[PDB]
């Protein structure tokens, strides 16, 4: 029923606030300068990057920075998943599978919140790295962020807020079609209810946004292609940048992925 769907929506929003210290609302306030005493440090070149260290080669430093950020996000997203009703009762192997296949899709969703066409917030919003600086990085590091910016500009045009995002993220995590899932039915049942909640949320929160629900569902499929592309890049780096290795948590996620 409708009241149940709204209580679910609100529960997910509350869990989202509890799990993710930097929200889209906060990020947008920083990006448009509608905040008090906190104007972010801009990284646009090598010298800019040097100055921002107080507050290896350049491309590796950036790469390793994304990795540390990524492991923090994995921890936050796991804490969020555990508050999705029904999730912690799933077979624990299926929870691992859901997390393994869903976590990067969520990371790139939430990255969009921190992005505009010109760059991305770093260091909990204390810094801003330009899209152009990231593009300047040597092969094969210079192309890693471009598909994420491309996605973000179009995704951000949908004007979703944190309350919409909380349900969106939950729907993605509870995907019954991940490889290796033992018990698909209970996952699909939870996702079905989350989808109803999302549909009602989008209708009430954005009544005049045409076919918003359909548009959002398509974005979920687009996210998988972004992950695919990123994984391909990571295999290039593993093969040809042999001195390096991923953080152990990231190694675990990427091992036997697809």
């Amino acid at each position: 029923e409708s009241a149940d769907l709204r209580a679910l929506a609100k529960h997910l929003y509350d869990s989202y606030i509890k799990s993710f210290p930097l929200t889209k609302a906060k990020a947008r306030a920083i990006l448009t300068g509608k905040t008090t005493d906190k104007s972010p440090f801009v990284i646009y070149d090598m010298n800019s990057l040097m100055m921002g260290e107080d507050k290896k080669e350049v491309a590796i430093r950036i790469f390793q920075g994304c990795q540390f950020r990524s492991v923090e996000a994995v921890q936050e997203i796991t804490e969020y998943a555990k508050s999705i009703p029904g999730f912690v009762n799933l077979d624990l192997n299926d929870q691992v599978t859901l997390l393994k296949y869903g976590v990067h899709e969520i990371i790139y969703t939430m990255l969009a919140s921190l992005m505009n066409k010109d760059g991305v917030l770093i260091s909990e919003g204390q810094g801003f790295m330009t899209r152009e600086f990231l593009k300047s990085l040597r092969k094969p590091f210079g192309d890693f962020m471009e598909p994420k910016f491309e996605f973000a500009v179009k995704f951000n045009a949908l004007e979703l807020d944190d309350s919409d995002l909380a349900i969106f993220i939950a729907v993605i995590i509870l995907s019954g079609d991940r490889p290796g899932l033992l018990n698909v039915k209970p996952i699909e049942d939870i996702q079905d209810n989350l989808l109803q909640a999302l549909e009602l949320q989008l209708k009430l929160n954005h009544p005049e946004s045409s076919q918003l629900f359909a548009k959002l569902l398509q974005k979920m499929t687009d996210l998988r292609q972004i992950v695919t592309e990123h994984v391909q890049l990571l295999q290039v780096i593993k093969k040809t940048e042999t001195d390096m290795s991923l953080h152990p948590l990231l190694q675990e996620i990427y091992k036997d992925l697809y």
């Binding site: 624990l92 691992v96 997390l99 675990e252």
Partner: peptide, 10 residues
């Protein structure tokens, strides 16, 4: 291994 630990922490 690490994912299981994160999933079962209280």
């Amino acid at each position: 291994h690490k994912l299981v630990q994160l999933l079962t922490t209280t």
